[PDB]
């Protein structure tokens, strides 16, 4: 966990950028990956925190460069570029500003019905065109088998727990595993190019014209399942939950509803088993701690 100055941050783009010159500078914004730094007031640049994030800052940068006249909103472009070391894959990419508000739950619910209804429409749209790129020409990296993914992460919470947990848990934990990968509904999907963090902190939105006006952070977009960008819109605390998601759907012109529905539900009860394992790859403790505490108590 690397943290910046304004000094750093400006001597790092200098270099590279010398005939930029940068009048302004504060933070934008902080995530698990990047700090976001709004330099003139006018470009968000962002840093990594360690080599994890500056791998998704690099993907982010490439996914960008190969999708940013494809889609019916704006989306981060990316104007300047940083530089790989032994330690980062990319040492900061700076975009252009996005001007706008995230379309949070609370700012969603009030708005006039009408408005509510455009942004599902809206959604839809960038949904549907998002996930009809063709795909042909992107790196086979991208692809994220998901059941590839749930084997492996079998493997890594045995790895992890295997001295912490008692093994009549241990065992209780490899029958949901297995349970889940008999389960066919959550493996069998076309893949195509995802957001894989749709979420509504990722949504912008002009509260002078009621739209939205921008999808941002695409640090985790990758090719696969595309019902990932639904069911992070469904969960009721955080996100919009199903009554706005089933506009979306309606919109997206979605087939098979209740199979969404099931891949929400997993992946609901999926929650405990990832803040272990994400807490490990991105370092974060606390959410280890806490979903290993909730396994003891499943
Ligand atoms: N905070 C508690 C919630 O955390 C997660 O959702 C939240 C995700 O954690 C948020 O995503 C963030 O964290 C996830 C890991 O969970 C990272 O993969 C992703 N790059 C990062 O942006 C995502 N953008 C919003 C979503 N509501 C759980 N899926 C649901 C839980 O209620
Ligand atoms: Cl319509």
New binding site residues.
Partial sequence: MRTYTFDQVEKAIEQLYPDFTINTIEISGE???CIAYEINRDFIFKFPKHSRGST?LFNEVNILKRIHNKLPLPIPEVVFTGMPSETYQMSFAGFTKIKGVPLTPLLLNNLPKQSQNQAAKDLARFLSELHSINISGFKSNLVLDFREKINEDNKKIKKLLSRELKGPQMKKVDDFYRDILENEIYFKYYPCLIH??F????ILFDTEKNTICGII?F??AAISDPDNDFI?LM?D???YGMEFVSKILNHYKHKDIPTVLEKYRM??KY?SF??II?GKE?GYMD?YEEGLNEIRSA
């Fill in positions: 995530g698990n990956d998704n894989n963090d979420s509504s902190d990722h952070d640090g985790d992070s969960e605390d955080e996100e992946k609901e929650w990832e803040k994400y991105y959410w």
